[PDB]
């Protein structure tokens, strides 16, 4: 370490776009139209996503059915794993049941009853699992307070036999315009997490959160991603359709010496 | 700390452009034409530089006279301090003698006879001083080996009564295409330096080195600057004419919480 990364694993890009918070996805789900879902699956895959996040959004429909449908629909057209994005454990498990390959669970909080439910499920289905550094008492402001919750996630994951390489800790980034002070604490938390065990737990962020409902988001997203990667970030749920963002990531990845430099590294990175 | 900065000092931009390695500067110096020097002084000032680097470049002329002339010529049209960029101590001192305000000396190596000459000169003229993490044995590859030389710089500066706030340690960045492995070690060195004393020594880089004689430099420069700033960088000799670079810096500066967020932060940053 500290800033010299222990490993050289490719940065993991999790395409954010198949998420019922978006109208087109919400309506495709309403009309059970698989076309918009498959279009976004293909697009994200073509941009180099390693996982596709899958989030039902708000719905009065049975989320179990919706999640199932999304997963099957996506995996019908691309050979990519899903990052199953829900607080509903039955929605998650339904997705895991029809999922081809190793999925990612998104996510468990540091709440004990959440951990007790989600960890055995990741173990059972051999899925990676995201653990958010938060509980019912809320999201901690301080890096140190986030880190405690991180420690608690590590302990529980390990207690379920889940390897650290399968555990992705999310310190929860918040919009810089209304929660500016969090952004730097998150960086420091990422650094701390990378110290917690050997091998270390991985780290992940909902990157776009940092600019949500801010003006001129693309600059802010790509700046923060570079900062986070520097701090040790292993993965991000992010807009893989943003070419400038992915260029930024590929450049940081080279500058961290995790992939051998060549003149065509911007392309190389997207294939990896 | 660690990544949460102790302070909130504005990032220090040192305009790189008045440097005899550039033909127009070299020729302005040859013809003793003050116009190109003053033009670049004004331009850089308008882009928000806090210092202007001043480097004679290669010349068969008396560097003492050249440096004097450059400093007077620059300060004739802008109210900015100079970052006097030479290995010739008499060139440096000549510049310090005619310099208006507090200059920066660029630089001393960790060579003992260099330190013994340059440190008393900074003290005497009340100039900030850059110390490069290198000596006659060469530039160390490892962060740890760079850090030792950093430690030696701190010790000597302190032994001359120079405050840490006046000492800028340069771990020497090298082009990523031929010395890729250095870039991450430099980051780790910056982090380490920020730990060496209280208050900590400052840090600085010749940023453009990272892409020198590489294709598509602007992306690489701005990515690395963001990484370096994240690691703790306080200043950089850089191309302040590169708007994308300065946007990148301003965004990182906000994300580090060193300046209160507002929607117009890209402008705000350039005035500060
Ligand atoms: N583990 C984890 N999972 C997450 C998040 C996280 O943090 N951590 N955060 C979220 C990450 N995904 C997104 C997806 C889109 C946006 C986004 O920004 N949406 C547009 C929608 C615009 C439109 O509707 O057209 C907006 O402006 O609000 C933000 C985060 C959801 N999942
Ligand atoms: N303390 C310190 N001082 C420094 C450096 C450093 O590290 N540390 N490194 C240098 C930083 N300044 C520059 C200025 C320009 C360029 C640059 O890249 N020049 C163009 C010139 C093109 C042209 O001639 O038109 C090029 O392509 O080579 C690189 C570093 C000099 N001073």
Query: Is the separation of the CB atoms in B59 and B31 below 8 Å?
Result: no
Contact across the interface for B261 and A180, Cβ inside 8 Å: yes
Both tokens assigned to A91: 């929605």
- Please tell me whether the peptide bond between A86 and the residue prior to it is cis, using omega within 30 degrees of 0: no
Closest alpha carbon to B234 in B181, B180, B165, B172: B165
Closest alpha carbon to B235 in B194, B260, B205: B205
- For residue B112, the SS3 value is helix
Residues linked to residue B247 through DSSP beta bridges, in sequence order: none
Contact across the interface for A176 and B261, Cβ inside 8 Å: yes
CA quadruple A77, A78, A84, A89: dihedral, nearest 10: 50
- CA A147, CA A103: separation in Å to the nearest integer? 26
Greatest alpha-carbon span in chain A: 51
- CA B255, CA A210: separation in Å to the nearest integer? 9
Query: Is the separation of the CB atoms in A16 and A238 below 8 Å?
Result: yes
Query: Is the separation of the CB atoms in B211 and B217 below 8 Å?
Result: yes
CB distance from B251 to chain A under 8 Å?
yes
Which residue is it, tokens 């809320």? A138
Both tokens assigned to B188: 């780790």
- CA B201, CA B13: separation in Å to the nearest integer? 17
- CA B41, CA A118: separation in Å to the nearest integer? 61
- CA B181, CA A174: separation in Å to the nearest integer? 33
Q: How was this structure determined?
A: X-ray
- CA B63, CA B58: separation in Å to the nearest integer? 9
**Would you say the CB of residue B108 lies under 6 angstroms from ligand 2?**
no
What CATH number should be reported for the domain whose range is A1-272?
Answer: 3.20.20.20
- CA B269, CA B272: separation in Å to the nearest integer? 5
Distances (CA, A) of B216 to A15, A145, A173, B139, B236: 26, 41, 31, 26, 20
- CA A121, CA A95: separation in Å to the nearest integer? 12
Both tokens assigned to B204: 């600085």
Polymer length of chain A = 272
Query: Is the separation of the CB atoms in A173 and A182 below 8 Å?
Result: yes
Ligand nearest to the CA of A203: 1
Closest alpha carbon to A196 in A169, A219, A214: A169
- CA A101, CA A92: separation in Å to the nearest integer? 15
Cβ count near A123 (within 10 Å): 16
- CA B180, CA B191: separation in Å to the nearest integer? 19
Write the DSSP symbol of residue A106.
Answer: E
In chain A, where the domains are located? 1-272
Query: Is the separation of the CB atoms in A195 and B238 below 8 Å?
Result: no
- CA B24, CA B207: separation in Å to the nearest integer? 21
Q: Determine which residue's CA is closest to atom 23 belonging to ligand 1.
A: A22
- CA A92, CA A88: separation in Å to the nearest integer? 6
Which residue is it, tokens 């000459």? B117
Closest alpha carbon to B254 in A84, A30, A181, A243: A181
Does B257 carry a binding-site annotation?
no
Query: Resolution in angstroms for this experimental structure?
Result: 2.2
Residues having CB within 6 Å of any atom of ligand 1: A 16, 19, 21-23, 85, 106-107, 130, 132, 170, 172, 206, 208-209, 212, 237
- CA B220, CA A261: separation in Å to the nearest integer? 12
- CA A204, CA A105: separation in Å to the nearest integer? 12
Closest alpha carbon to A229 in A180, A271, A269: A269
Cβ count near B49 (within 10 Å): 27
Closest alpha carbon to A170 in A127, A124, A139: A139
- CA A35, CA A14: separation in Å to the nearest integer? 20
Q: In terms of DSSP bridges, do strands B128-132 and B167-170 run parallel, antiparallel, or are they unpaired?
A: parallel
Q: In terms of DSSP bridges, do strands A235-238 and B12-15 run parallel, antiparallel, or are they unpaired?
A: unpaired
- CA B29, CA B13: separation in Å to the nearest integer? 24
For A232-262, b where at least 16 C-beta lie within 10 A, e where not — what string? bbbbbbbbbbbeebbbbbbbbbbbbbbbebe
- CA B92, CA B85: separation in Å to the nearest integer? 8
Distances (CA, A) of A14 to A17, A166, A207: 9, 15, 10
- CA B48, CA A119: separation in Å to the nearest integer? 52
Contact across the interface for B226 and A231, Cβ inside 8 Å: no
Q: Which positions ≥6 away from A34 have C-beta within 8 Å?
A: A28, A73, A76
Distances (CA, A) of B66 to A34, B56, B101, B108: 72, 7, 19, 20
């Amino acid at each position: 370490g500290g800033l010299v990364p222990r490993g050289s694993h490719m940065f993991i890009m999790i395409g954010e776009r198949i998420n019922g918070m978006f109208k087109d996805i919400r309506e495709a789900i309403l009309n059970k139209d698989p076309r918009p879902i498959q279009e976004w699956a293909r697009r994200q895959a073509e941009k180099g996503a390693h996982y596709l996040d899958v989030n039902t959004g708000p719905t009065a429909d049975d989320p179990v059915r919706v999640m199932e449908w999304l997963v099957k629909t996506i995996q019908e057209v691309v050979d990519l794993p899903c990052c199953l994005d829900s607080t509903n454990p039955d929605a998650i498990e339904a997705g895991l049941k029809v999922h081809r390959g190793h999925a990612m669970i998104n996510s468990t909080s540091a709440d004990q009853w959440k951990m007790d439910i989600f960890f055995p499920m990741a173990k059972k289905y051999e899925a990676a699992i995201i653990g958010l550094t938060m509980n019912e008492k809320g999201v901690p402001k301080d890096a140190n307070d986030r880190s405690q919750l991180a420690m608690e996630l590590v302990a529980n994951a390990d207690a379920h036999g889940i390897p650290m390489t399968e555990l992705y800790i999310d310190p929860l980034i918040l919009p810089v315009n209304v929660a500016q002070e969090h952004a730097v604490e998150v960086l420091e938390t990422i650094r701390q997490i990378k110290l917690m065990a050997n091998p270390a737990p991985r780290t992940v962020l909902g990157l776009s959160n940092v600019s949500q409902k801010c003006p001129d988001r693309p600059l802010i997203n790509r700046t923060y991603l570079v900062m986070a990667m520097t701090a040790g970030l292993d993965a991000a749920i992010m807009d893989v359709d943003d070419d400038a963002l992915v260029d930024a990531a590929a450049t940081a990845h080279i500058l961290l010496n995790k992939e051998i430099y060549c003149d065509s590294y911007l392309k190389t990175f997207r294939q990896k």
